[PDB]
Amino acid sequence: TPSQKMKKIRAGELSPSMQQRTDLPAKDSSKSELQLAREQLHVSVVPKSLPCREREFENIYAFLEGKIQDQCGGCMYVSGVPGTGKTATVTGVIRTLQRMAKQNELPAFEYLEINGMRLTEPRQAYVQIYKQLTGKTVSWEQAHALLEKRFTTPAPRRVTTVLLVDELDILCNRRQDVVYNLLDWPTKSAAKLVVVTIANTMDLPERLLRLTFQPYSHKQLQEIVTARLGGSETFKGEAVQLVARKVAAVSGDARRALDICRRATEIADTAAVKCVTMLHVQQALAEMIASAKVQAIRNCSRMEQIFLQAIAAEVTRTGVEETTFMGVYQQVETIAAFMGVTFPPPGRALRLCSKLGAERLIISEHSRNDLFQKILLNVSADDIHYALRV
Amino acid sequence: MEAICSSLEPLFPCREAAIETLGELIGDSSETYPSAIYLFGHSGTGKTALTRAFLKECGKRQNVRTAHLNAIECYTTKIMLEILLDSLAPDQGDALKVDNMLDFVEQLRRQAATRVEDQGFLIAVDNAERLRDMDANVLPVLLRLQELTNLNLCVILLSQLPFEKFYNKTGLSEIVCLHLAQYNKAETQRILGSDFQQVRNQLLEQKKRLEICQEAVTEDFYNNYLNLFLSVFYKACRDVPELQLTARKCLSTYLEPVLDGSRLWRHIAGPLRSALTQIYMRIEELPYYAKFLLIAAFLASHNAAKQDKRLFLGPKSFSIDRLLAIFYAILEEKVGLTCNLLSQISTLVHLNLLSFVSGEQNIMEGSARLQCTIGLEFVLQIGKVVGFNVRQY
Amino acid sequence: RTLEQLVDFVVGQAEREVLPTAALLTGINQPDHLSQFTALTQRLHAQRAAMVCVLQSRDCATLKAAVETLVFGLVEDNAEVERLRRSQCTMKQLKSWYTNNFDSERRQLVVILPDFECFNASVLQDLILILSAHCGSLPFVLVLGVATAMTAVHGTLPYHVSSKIRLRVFQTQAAPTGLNEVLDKVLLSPKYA
Amino acid sequence: PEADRELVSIRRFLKERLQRDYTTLRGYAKERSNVRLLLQRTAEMGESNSLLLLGPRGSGKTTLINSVLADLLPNKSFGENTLIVHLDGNLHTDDRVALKSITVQMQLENAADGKVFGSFAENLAFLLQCLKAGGKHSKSVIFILEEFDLFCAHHNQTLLYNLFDVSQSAQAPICVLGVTCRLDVIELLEKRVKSRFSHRQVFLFPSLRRFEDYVDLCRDLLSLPTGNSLLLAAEKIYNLQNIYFSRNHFDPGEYGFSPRLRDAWNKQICKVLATQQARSTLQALHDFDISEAYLKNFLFRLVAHLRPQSPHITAEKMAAVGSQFEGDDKIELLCGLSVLELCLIIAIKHHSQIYDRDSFNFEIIYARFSKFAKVSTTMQAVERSIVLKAFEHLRIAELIMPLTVQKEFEMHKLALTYSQIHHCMQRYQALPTEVAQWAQS
DNA sequence: GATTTTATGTTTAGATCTTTTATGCTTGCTTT
DNA sequence: AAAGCAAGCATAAAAGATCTAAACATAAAATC
Ligand SMILES: Nc1ncnc2c1ncn2[C@@H]1O[C@H](COP(=O)(O)OP(=O)(O)OP(=O)(O)O)[C@@H](O)[C@H]1O
Ligand SMILES: Nc1ncnc2c1ncn2[C@@H]1O[C@H](COP(=O)(O)OP(=O)(O)OP(=O)(O)O)[C@@H](O)[C@H]1O
Ligand SMILES: Nc1ncnc2c1ncn2[C@@H]1O[C@H](COP(=O)(O)OP(=O)(O)OP(=O)(O)O)[C@@H](O)[C@H]1O
Ligand SMILES: [Mg+2]
Ligand SMILES: [Mg+2]
Ligand SMILES: [Mg+2]
């Protein structure tokens, strides 16, 4: 019955599950060396020992060990550009500490975790912390009182519990109350809490209320993929350098280097060659790091090409970038007079403006205020002539 | 497709072409329908009666489930979904319960049936010009509802605006535009002359006068009366319902000197030029100090901010201390400032003799800006009924 | 005379789409007319051919508020002659409730608007357009308490709202005339000391 | 009259092909094979992937997805491992409605017969707990997110942040496939969601930029196919309906044609497309908009005119529907106006021509009109009231727009270029000559 | 099994932060 | 000397954009 099952979910005794595959999973022996190279190159498969992160690993390990043996607790704030492997490092060091606790070299502890964007309202986080405590579920105000009752009361034995915090910035409110309580909770010496928050901007507590994972350079981003590949020589040794040069400057994501190599491995599968070539990596970088705004302007119909020339001529003639539609239509009638092809009457030109605005070649207003709607140019003006002649 | 247009042509003369177009697009129901049909024309073109006659004729004659709607009723989208599903899924009862566009799409998706009964759907949204003012996901869904629900529908829309006003920043799918031209004068004469039998049978209802009504209210006499009427009002309006509504009353005042004994254009061209003055309008005092306050309000809102030192772009807004100063200057008796006089200020506010533009939160601070709203003629009537001329200032 | 003319107009519209409506040129003051309107409601609950909800301008900040107070006032006036949700009281529920009750007899649906001047123009035009959309299925009449003159009705109503309306004017007596009658007939009547 | 029944059969078949037939795809051999091999890789091998179709509106985005799923679903290896989660941005407005449609359409145990219990936060935590349980031994989930940009318009892009995070963990073998129109929608994503995204994109700019294959597609859509193609398409539609769009479709098997009738019809269509007039009209439409939805709309309104009294397609019908397309309608609205509104329009034209597009008002135009009214000797009889009704009627047909006070004293702006007014003076029927002499002044 | 009650998730309307614009007002220069 | 236009200016109000407090309808369980 539905009532017994919703009570089974709310007390948590029913395990969530997905339907299993009816067909068995495919056997490992049939996989090609390129296919195994692709499967080891997926972003999900985090190595047990992370290449080129050993300094931050030993820092977090010595810190959390010296805070979890001495029973004192506190706060720590790691931060950096996304793609720097923060959460993989902190989850890896907590995994090593729990593996240590199974061998009883360390006092036992419960590892809690949250994630700010897996919540709805920020106050719902008060339910989730308690959901990984006793496992009981309750409304957030009673959850607030019970988190207080586990935290305000000096009642030994109080086991230390770490609190990893994904995405602290999404927990901000107009009151900023939840993040403020999550920071104030370690200050109680009786409830031996320690919190490890993970964030992107480096100065958030100053901005609206340490450790910094710097982005990978060319050699670290070489080292990550060349340890990920294993002993197969499916990649030539310069293709990883080419990926590291074209990714280490732009953003430094580890995920971008990995799926660029994976998509290049897929293009090598399309070429039916067992080893990649550097032009495969050139094709993968040309596809995944691109805008087709040149190809879009090349493949618009001729009246939108006339319209796109006319907005650029209007930014030249009036000298401002945002234009009223009537001056664009006057420049349109000039260019259509020069080319010798007639232009559609202005309602169809409003349709062309709305269609190019849907494609974000230009930023246009709703067409209820025709011949007074503002028009910006979104594509850069040189790309128009570069797509139209070349 | 033949029976529907053949049954709607006699009711709707001078409109054979638009009926031919709609009866080819959504006439037969075994055929598929286009995803949306946007027909439009001026006020009084005859489209609400046209689509309503088309939906009731198709839903009585054939397999379709029809639904009419008026978009001004739908001040929130769930009321629109309730009316649409309440007509499209008959006898649902009070088990109907739609919350958003997804639930309406699923409950319309379940209504799909086998092709062998060849069902269709139709939806008409009158006054669709309001549809762009509301939630602004309703128009893109309403155009491609056939693709979305995988049914066999066709969402008609109706407005006076051309379709090019309707576009938004995300764009819309395909639509079938359709224009209805307003009538030229010969066709408006044909429309007003089609009802000659009904107006003769009405005139027979109200015996020498009935003896001359039955002998001299014939067809060509009514055609000459219609030419004599459209010689006058056609330049002022082509709106066919107003021409019917005024043409019957002017026939009632026209018929007197053929009830007794051209030979008529003078007798009716008298009253017709008074009848033009009362087009569109459809019909069938002040306290003394409020008079002086309305006079001083017109002086404060017309005689500028700097002419008033020597007397003492549209109308100009003014603070009320300027109004009390002009009231003191024009009063020549100097009344004490009782509560009743400031109450008279607030009653000229409430009766739309004055208006507010700003300062509403601090009217007692005197910083509020007011705006007198009266033309020259009535304030001259006020200065006449007082006898105090206002043209000197 | 005016009250019997109004009741005769309501019954003659029950004898009967452009909605009938009857403006009544009330004086510039308000409270003197109020009891007059209540007496009119009693007459339409005397002959039992109409039910009536006053639609004061305080209740019409928006079109949604106007429609809910209209439907709630009609259903609660009918209950008072003999508690559904505020979020549910749409015009469609009013149509289903009217055909749920009144069909085997046709009681008129009266909506007094005592302060025609005080309304915001947009909500008023939308309300008259909605009531024009539903006339024929629901027998409506509308009465306008215009505190000024006919130019306010012809000016405030737009081209199209005036095109879809059928207004007829009645006149209550002017205030100086009323003070003249009250002074000749009561305060100068001999029989009070 | 069986031949007239044959023409009714051709007309119904043609309207079904132009309007329905959601599966068949023309061209795009590279992108369709790319999406198809990605879907087989996420169905069989258990890889998680992300993809983002982009293109102009009216390019074959949804039709490509229907062709790929119609090829893959009756494999019955794809049909047993995959649970497909369709999603839209127009219908699933705020994220909670999308999450309820996910929990309903995955047949999760929390849902029951199309209705889900519990709080939305509970449904979110339960959905992540279900996707957490998957290894490679779980069924592969295939999200298809049409209108990705409106999902970017959600708060925090929060659903998207989860939908890519499952792709970058070794949990359930999903496959996110966004489909959207904007070509820089990847800029809209927040830098976390931009980081989690696989950056691969697939563009579908239409291949019919040249005129000749546009005429080839027009020759294709009007032709009746040979009968063995009808048998093969009937077998394909039957095999897909044995196992959503499938309940109503093109279904060629209800229609059968004699080969001589196919030869006569396609001879008529190739001969009609050979003529210079039909090529001129299609040249005009191809200069307007290349997108195939426009040509399918034009073809539907051409095919609908095939009455039994005039059975054959002719080039003059092409020219007639092209004349309906290329004409303006504001010029067709201004010819409906009566002479008083037209004089108010021409007074606004003279005012904004003399003072150069300055804003106007009813009283300034009343002065400019009463300069003409007292010398007209045909407009003497009108008052302030009829002209005020004409002014409000010009306001409500949106030939005048407010600059965004009395009804007679709003500021206003004209909505027309002068060529529209100069043309509507010409195309108007029976304009009085005195207004024409004012038009020449 | 039905009612009631109340605990809670959802909705809706107001509150508040931008920022635009903007306009009455300051005051200050300039001019007849 | 004052009268009028002007650089600006400084708060104000008008969307408008976005969030929070109050309401409120619904789910669910306690009890009769
Ligand atoms: N040293 C490394 N060796 C191999 N792979 C790595 C390394 N560091 C990071 N990665 C890759 O990057 C991903 C790390 O994910 P993680 O969640 O830690 O990123 P993040 O820095 O926390 O991003 P965000 O801060 O935006 O959540 C893993 O999928 C892993 O494949
Ligand atoms: N060809 C015709 N023959 C007979 N009557 C006609 C014809 N055309 C219009 N009418 C009359 O027009 C009236 C309907 O016009 P309709 O109300 O559809 O205009 P509208 O576009 O809805 O105006 P609005 O949108 O301003 O309400 C009917 O009373 C009908 O009798
Ligand atoms: N490449 C194509 N091949 C076949 N038919 C096409 C193609 N492109 C468009 N069409 C036709 O256009 C109509 C709509 O196309 P489609 O559904 O692909 O656009 P769409 O994906 O809805 O665009 P959007 O999602 O941006 O609104 C369909 O009737 C289809 O027959
Ligand atoms: Mg992380
Ligand atoms: Mg209408
Ligand atoms: Mg699509």
Side-chain angles (χ1 to χ4, degrees), chain B residues 144 147 170-174, chain D residues 17-28 55-66 90 146-147 179-182 204 206-208 217 221 291-294 296:
Chain B
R144 58 167 62 193
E147 181 188 306
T170 64
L172 316 180
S173 68
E174 288 294 324
Chain D
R17 199 202 292 159
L18 302 172
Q19 271 299 135
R20 298 177 185 270
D21 186 86
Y22 301 80
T23 51
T24 70
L25 177 50
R26 281 175 307 269
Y28 297 79
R57 198 158 305 252
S59 45
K61 292 186 286 292
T62 298
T63 307
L64 176 139
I65 299 305
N66 293 350
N90 314 311
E146 201 167 3
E147 285 86 10
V179 173
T180 178
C181 201
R182 295 186 25 176
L204 279 82
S207 47
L208 73 175
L217 184 150
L221 291 193
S291 296
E292 287 146 335
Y294 201 65
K296 284 185 184 197

Side-chain angles (χ1 to χ4, degrees), chain D residues 59-114:
Chain D
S59 45
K61 292 186 286 292
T62 298
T63 307
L64 176 139
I65 299 305
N66 293 350
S67 176
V68 168
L69 291 203
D71 264 359
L72 292 183
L73 271 178
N75 264 2
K76 295 174 198 143
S77 68
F78 184 82
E80 305 270 336
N81 296 317
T82 55
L83 54 94
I84 307 160
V85 180
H86 284 289
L87 269 184
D88 196 292
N90 314 311
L91 320 168
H92 313 80
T93 65
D94 206 314
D95 62 349
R96 84 191 43 188
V97 181
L99 212 68
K100 282 172 48 212
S101 167
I102 286 169
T103 309
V104 159
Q105 198 165 3
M106 281 176 56
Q107 300 204 334
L108 275 198
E109 65 187 2
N110 212 324
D113 58 89

